[PDB]
Amino acid sequence: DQICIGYHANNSTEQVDTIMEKNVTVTHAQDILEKTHNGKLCDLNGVKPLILKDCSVAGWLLGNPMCDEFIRVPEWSYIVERANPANDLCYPGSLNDYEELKHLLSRINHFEKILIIPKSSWPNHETSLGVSAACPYQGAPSFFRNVVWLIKKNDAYPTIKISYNNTNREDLLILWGIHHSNNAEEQTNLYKNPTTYISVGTSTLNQRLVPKIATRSQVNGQRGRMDFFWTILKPDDAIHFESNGNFIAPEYAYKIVKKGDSTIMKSGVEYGHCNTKCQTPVGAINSSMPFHNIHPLTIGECPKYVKSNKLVLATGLRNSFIEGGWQGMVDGWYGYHHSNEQGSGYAADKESTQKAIDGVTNKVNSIIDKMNTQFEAVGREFNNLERRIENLNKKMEDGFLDVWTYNAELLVLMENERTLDFHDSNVKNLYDKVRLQLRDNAKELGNGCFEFYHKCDNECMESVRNGTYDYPQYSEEARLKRE
Amino acid sequence: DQICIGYHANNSTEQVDTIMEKNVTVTHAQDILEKTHNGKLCDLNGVKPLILKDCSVAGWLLGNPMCDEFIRVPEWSYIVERANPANDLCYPGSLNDYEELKHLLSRINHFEKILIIPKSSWPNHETSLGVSAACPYQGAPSFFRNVVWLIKKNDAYPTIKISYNNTNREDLLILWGIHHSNNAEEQTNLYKNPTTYISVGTSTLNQRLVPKIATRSQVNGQRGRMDFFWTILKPDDAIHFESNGNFIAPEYAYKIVKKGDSTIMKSGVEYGHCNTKCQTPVGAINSSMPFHNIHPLTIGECPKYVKSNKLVLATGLRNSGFIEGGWQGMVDGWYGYHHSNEQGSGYAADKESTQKAIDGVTNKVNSIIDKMNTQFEAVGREFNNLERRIENLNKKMEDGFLDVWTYNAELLVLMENERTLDFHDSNVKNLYDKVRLQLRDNAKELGNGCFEFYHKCDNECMESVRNGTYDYPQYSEEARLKRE
């Protein structure tokens, strides 16, 4: 007659690694890496992205004839641009501090186009001839919608002197431009005056632009260029313009209220009519895990980006003193095996099992819950002449990856070694617990099993489970069986 | 007739957490997170803050009339500027590379204002009428004090050609400016000549400033602007000024000796006449504790900022099997025995042990605290409105490190808290196995950590077991079969 101690086993093929052991099959495990995304582009905390479709921020702000004319959405969480937008600046040129405009515009609380300078103004200049085949619309030379390319009237370009006082109680993005002529004959044809200037002045601005009449290479069929510039007029200030030529005037402006920052995402994915707290260019993440492998460039409260393909934490017994585990036990992690004629089968320690499941559950939940995330946009906004600042971002991003990867990977290895010793310690505690309540009525064979001199009743079996066994009641019976 | 092995207990209400257990009341513990600051702005390593008050670094340098600081301080460790300094540039304008000047001027070993171009010079120009109500002094038109606004004399502005050769052994901070006049008449009225220029040349500097005459908005009452520029003249180089008009010319300059860096702090806290190693905008920290939760923007040899509100390590043991419940009675040690016989009773501690524990856990707390390597650092923002992307780059780094330290520090507590408690469970079990290894046949195992000696328990064998000199042949036959 005998009794043994044992641990649970199942069909699980899940394999974990420890700091000292590799490829250890376990009964239960948990991965703390999120590898899943929804594959769509969603709202971020209830606000929809501004999806510019084959347009750039420049083509949308200035009025590229082939960009959407109306701003349907008054607010966005992020701007979604295609990798190499097709439309941009139809008339070749430049937009000043473009990348900083895009950061300001990446998340806007309120956006609303308003007419600031009506074409009714400029009665002595021409408002109708300012078109180019570079900016085509419906088979006709057109031009940017929200600015005006003024031209000479009757071989006369009177100097312009115009002001706009912001009465709107909100900041105003205002845009203007300079046309760089290509020869001295072209200059006088478009603007009678041969030497020209643009003077822009606000409370914070003092600008003089002068054309650069020079030979350049054709882009979009034109050798001319247009350089655009922008300012924000604060709620009760004025902007003052003066020019005798080469003035791409403002017609429409945009009311801006800004309370937050995010980034421009370069993605071809499509809107999914969903909501998310974490967004990648490949898709959105719905996870509470600490780490992920979906994409570097995320927006929102996102898991940490690591280089690991799997991060699996053992939460159970090793699966096959006791030579092996009991596939037969089906009601607890730690248990007893009884052998008497009255009955046969297995049994399991209720309290010890729940203590351990709470133990490993709290170990996992801590690792997950201790991670706190800051809303952050990992997008990158730098020019061809800002490539040294680009590497700082790369160094930062890459360094945190190497940190988060090494820490997460060794946390798993270390804590799995602790998780496994935790199990084998609990079982031996039950073995010794039985050994002390069975001092002389038992012998040790070394296989986690005792030798019953006494005849253990099923009630005795349960009396030893409770620990309510009385050794005096059966001490003499052992002396009889012995020798 | 039994002897029991047990551990210490007290009245502690302090709780710690571990990976597998939460809200566990323990006897002794230590918090490695510092939360307290002195509420005042202090000196740093024995050097004093340049507490500029309601005046910008620009206003003080150029000599805004409304600021009472001239050569008050010759050495500083950090600058304190208010969030929106009231005075700044009294005449509307700008200062080029201001944010970089504030970095250069952030820590200066030697600063001295020296007159460099005297008003005795410029004898063909008017040095007396260069005032504006924008710069007001005591209700009367005034101007910046370390610079001279030169206007016409006798309806003439002869061209200025002047030079200054640094005869000092220290580098010099020299400041000049340009007036952008509002209309063609105001140009002629202030400087006879209609079209003007400012050339500035050194060994590194080649400048040409031309005025921008344009309609602009009224700031501090004037539609005009003055834009200021700066250079550092090396010890035997010379600066060369040529101007037709519109020249704001240097009268004074500053001798500069720089040997380190430390940002501009934004605070309204006041000088406490103290010294610190670590300065927050809300106060100062005097701790060896490795982590802190007071302010992000710290200047000095500082701990590491975390989002934690509590980072309590556990130095002792648990509080109310081998010890079904701990004994509150023991006051002299962490690990100890209890004797039960008519001769005597009570709880008695161990000395080879208990101190071994104290020494080991305390070395653990010190090892965590000591291995933090402190780098003097300045966390402060010096980025303007068109440098927000570099500013986000800064915030991403700052936030990335916060999240790195917070996670590791909290898991380190949770992980090392479990090992501490299991260390204590291990220490008790060793002594129980030693008592069983001494007495073998003469006593029986009860199972509650309380050995039962069939033979009468001896106060004299107590210290004997404590040391292991107990003799079992002495009482072998005695109570060989005491029960039947």
Next chain:
Amino acid sequence: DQICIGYHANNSTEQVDTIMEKNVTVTHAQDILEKTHNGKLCDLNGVKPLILKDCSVAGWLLGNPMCDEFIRVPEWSYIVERANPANDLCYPGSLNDYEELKHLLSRINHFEKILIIPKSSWPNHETSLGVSAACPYQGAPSFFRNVVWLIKKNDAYPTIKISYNNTNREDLLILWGIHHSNNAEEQTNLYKNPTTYISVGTSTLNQRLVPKIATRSQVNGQRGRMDFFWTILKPDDAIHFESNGNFIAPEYAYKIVKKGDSTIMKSGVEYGHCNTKCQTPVGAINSSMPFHNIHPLTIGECPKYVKSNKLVLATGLRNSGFIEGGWQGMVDGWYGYHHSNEQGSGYAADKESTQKAIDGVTNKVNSIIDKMNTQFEAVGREFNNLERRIENLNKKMEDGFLDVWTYNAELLVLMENERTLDFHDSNVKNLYDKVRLQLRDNAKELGNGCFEFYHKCDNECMESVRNGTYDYPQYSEEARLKRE
């Protein structure tokens, strides 16, 4: 008779630290910190760096007379510059976006000099008189080799209009410059035209340069300055020049193919005809170790840089059986046995237990080493004097990362060394318990980890664990009569 379980000890003086103990002497150890370097500058992944000697990138590119005319380096992995390169820009001036050019030119797959505008292309201008003392070859006045200083011919300077179309299939780096004169007399003398300009236009480039004529101090004996600019002409684009004076024209240009980035290294070490994955200014590293301390500014796949002098992991035993005994005698194993019978006395090892620990300890070492195989390429420093704020950003970052790696590395070594030592303690106790679980009634526990044999024992009887199930009743009667 007697049998005893013990562990190994040797002559090792190697000491380690745990979280709870300090200077613990161990039998075996392993350092995961690399301190050895090659002491020379090597190839980086099979590609030889460009060592520019005492010429700067500007001097090499523009053709300082005192530099190698050209070199057979079409490809290079990084650029090695001296701390203060001597030759640089002989004629005083500037190169625009120099630090970005050095980044672009830092790793280049194809670099070839080609002649884009011949001296034949300047019929009505002088190609030969454009020389200066500041730029000297053999004491003789010379000038930059790859650009042409064009001056008047026949007291006349007809305005220039030249265009170059990049027929090649690679990008071209093109350089040009403007000459700032000193006085109006200088201007007319070299360029009859008093008021001059330079327009440069490509598909993306729209430039107007105009000379600044002012007095400046002497640098390299000349008070004038020459400011240089660059662009990258794309295949099938054209560059269009126009000037009536002060034009330092392009003569040669560079065919560039760029596929990567890798900083300029400031170093004086000599080339070693070696190859390495990691290069340091002091020398090269050939290590798989996770961390190092050789120098911060490394380029290549490199260990993490920490502030530690040693990071020693315990891989062995505590060194001076299971109770208070380190056996120097058993050289044959790690865990082992000692027998004391009438046959003799000697030492034995347990191979099934010794190997289980060696395999596990090597995994501890290997896991810590190999899990940080997230080595990536890296860089050094590249910012100017008006870029100190961005330079601080770099420093806060690489310092902050240093504080993260050193604190994490050291605690890991302290934590796992504590765990290693405890892991050895549990192994011997299980050997003791194996021998204890067998031979239960036939032996006496003496308190030293050694058992007392009541019955007589043979060398063959011990048999270590070879049998492992020595007959419980074969000698049970003999020990029953050995009782008293």
